[PDB]
Design an enzyme around this catalytic site. Structure first.
Site, PDB file in Angstrom:
ATOM      1  N   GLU A 135       5.650  -1.891 -11.047  1.00 57.83           N
ATOM      2  CA  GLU A 135       5.292  -3.275 -11.383  1.00 57.83           C
ATOM      3  C   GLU A 135       6.113  -3.885 -12.575  1.00 57.83           C
ATOM      4  O   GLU A 135       5.541  -4.288 -13.586  1.00 57.83           O
ATOM      5  CB  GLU A 135       3.802  -3.420 -11.625  1.00 57.83           C
ATOM      6  CG  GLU A 135       2.950  -3.008 -10.396  1.00 57.83           C
ATOM      7  CD  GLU A 135       1.559  -3.460 -10.440  1.00 57.83           C
ATOM      8  OE1 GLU A 135       1.034  -3.957 -11.443  1.00 57.83           O
ATOM      9  OE2 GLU A 135       0.880  -3.313  -9.339  1.00 57.83           O
ATOM     10  N   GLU A 223       1.191   1.022  -3.369  1.00 57.94           N
ATOM     11  CA  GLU A 223      -0.103   1.031  -4.076  1.00 57.94           C
ATOM     12  C   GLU A 223      -0.929  -0.183  -3.747  1.00 57.94           C
ATOM     13  O   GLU A 223      -0.530  -1.326  -3.945  1.00 57.94           O
ATOM     14  CB  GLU A 223       0.088   1.051  -5.624  1.00 57.94           C
ATOM     15  CG  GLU A 223      -1.219   1.394  -6.348  1.00 57.94           C
ATOM     16  CD  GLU A 223      -1.202   1.083  -7.823  1.00 57.94           C
ATOM     17  OE1 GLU A 223      -0.302   1.537  -8.570  1.00 57.94           O
ATOM     18  OE2 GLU A 223      -2.126   0.326  -8.256  1.00 57.94           O
TER      19      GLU A 223
END
Ligand SMILES: CO[C@H]1[C@H](O)[C@@H](O)[C@@H](O[C@H]2[C@H](O[C@@H]3CO[C@@H](O)[C@H](O)[C@H]3O)OC[C@@H](O[C@@H]3OC[C@@H](O)[C@H](O)[C@H]3O)[C@@H]2O)O[C@@H]1C(=O)O
Length: 383
Positions: A135, A223
């Protein structure tokens, strides 16, 4: 209504289905829990990918080994994700609140990642894939590091040759934003070092990503989880895992990796038992095995029915259907370019856990009739 399937029109390769090994942040999985999650028999989930985190402190890597080693012995592929470089490498000299990797330290960072991969290999849990960053578009108050698309392009151009047969993943955008990876995809001297375009689904929904797809990279959803305040046995919520899996497969994703495998909202509850979310996962993972090809199949044959179909390297044709109607729904199958003779039905619903529900003959013209139970995720397997 009618479902047309053509076994001769193929989409993506399915690598598999996975979850997160959380040891270091949460308690480790047990031997029994790994067997439940990574076996593919009755009552087992069928996972074949395990994700692990790369601690910035190399003295803590040892704790990853028992679970990863057992998963590799069960045929699983390990992928590793870093949340931050060691703090000293970064513009903020901190593991948290983002910060950028200093370009002066790109070689040192690559050595950190490769040291992790060497440690895993030497200790009997070799990596299949490694990510450059979790991220890069998110700067929370836990381990994190901010990158732009142009930084990934520079890094891969100068560092990518060092990864070798490890499959490199970028960028694990929080919302699968193409801005993070388009600069890499548009340059052949960055892109050649990449095998997988990875992304998460936070705040968004699965979508196709043609530039990635057309470059021969596998798309991996590395994820996600849904509503973490629900019990993983709440069926109203669990069925929407099914919706998200179907959308992921329609979006040409080769892999789908959940967050923590064992958790109140996970694939196993804290008692170690498979949850309704886990059973849903298994409707795909027990039956659509690694190396399967997704095939052409009417995706939305009637209101609130969504489906995908596959062929596995052994020839089992598999159909997976999500019924969000509270009523029985009939499908009229019309299959071309296959030699299917019968399908076996297995369903998960509010009351059923991958339960066998009958067989349907497939005639010489490729026609069959099958039924979906109310509020169900159903798999038909050719045998
Ligand atoms: C029920 O609580 C849940 C939360 O709802 C979850 O979001 C998750 O929180 C953990 C967080 O997970 C991140 C989720 O979003 C993704 O973008 C990201 O990639 C994930 O990493 O990770 C950090 C973790 O906190 C750490 O816990 C261990 C402790 O030693 C560390 O100091 C913390 O930073 C956070 O809990 O999972 C929660 C859960 O408890 O299951």
């Amino acid at each position: 209504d009618t479902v047309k399937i053509d076994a001769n029109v193929n989409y993506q390769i399915i690598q598999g289905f996975g979850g997160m090994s959380g040891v270091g942040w949460i308690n480790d999985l047990t031997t029994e829990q790994i067997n439940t999650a990574y076996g593919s028999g009755v009552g087992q989930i069928g996972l074949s990918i395990m994700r692990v985190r790369i601690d910035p402190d190399s003295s803590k890597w040892n704790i990853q080994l028992p679970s990863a080693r057992q998963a590799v012995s069960l045929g699983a592929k390990i992928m590793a994700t870093p949340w931050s470089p060691p703090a000293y490498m970064k513009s903020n000299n901190s593991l948290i609140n983002g910060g950028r990797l200093l370009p002066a330290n790109y070689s040192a960072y690559t050595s950190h990642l490769l040291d992790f991969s060497k440690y895993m290999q030497t200790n009997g849990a070799p990596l299949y894939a490694i990510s450059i960053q979790n991220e890069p578009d998110w700067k929370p108050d836990y381990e994190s590091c901010e990158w732009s698309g142009d930084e990934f392009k520079s890094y891969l151009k100068s560092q990518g040759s060092k990864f070798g047969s490890l499959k490199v993943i970028v960028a694990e955008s929080l919302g699968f934003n193409p801005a993070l990876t388009d600069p890499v995809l548009k340059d052949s001297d960055a892109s050649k070092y990449v095998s997988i375009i990875g992304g998460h689904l936070y705040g968004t929904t699965p979508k196709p990503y043609p530039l990635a797809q057309n470059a021969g990279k596998q798309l991996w959803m590395t994820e996600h989880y849904v509503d973490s305040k629900q019990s993983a046995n709440n069926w109203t919520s669990a069925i929407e895992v099914g919706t998200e899996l179907n959308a992921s497969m329609v979006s040409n994703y080769s892999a789908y990796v959940w967050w923590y495998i064992r958790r109140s909202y996970g694939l196993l509850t804290e008692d170690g038992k498979v949850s309704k979310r886990g059973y849903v996962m298994s409707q795909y993972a027990r039956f659509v095995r690694p190396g399967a090809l997704r095939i052409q199949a009417t995706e939305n044959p009637q209101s609130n029915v969504h489906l995908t179909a596959y062929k596995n390297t052994d020839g089992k044709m598999v159909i997976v259907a999500v019924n969000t109607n509270d009523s029985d729904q009939m499908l009229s199958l019309n299959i071309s370019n296959a030699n299917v003779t019968k399908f076996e039905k297995y369903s998960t619903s509010a009351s059923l856990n991958v339960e066998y529900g009958g067989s349907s003959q497939v005639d010489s013209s490729g026609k069959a009739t099958v039924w979906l139970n109310p509020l169900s995720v159903t798999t038909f397997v050719s045998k």
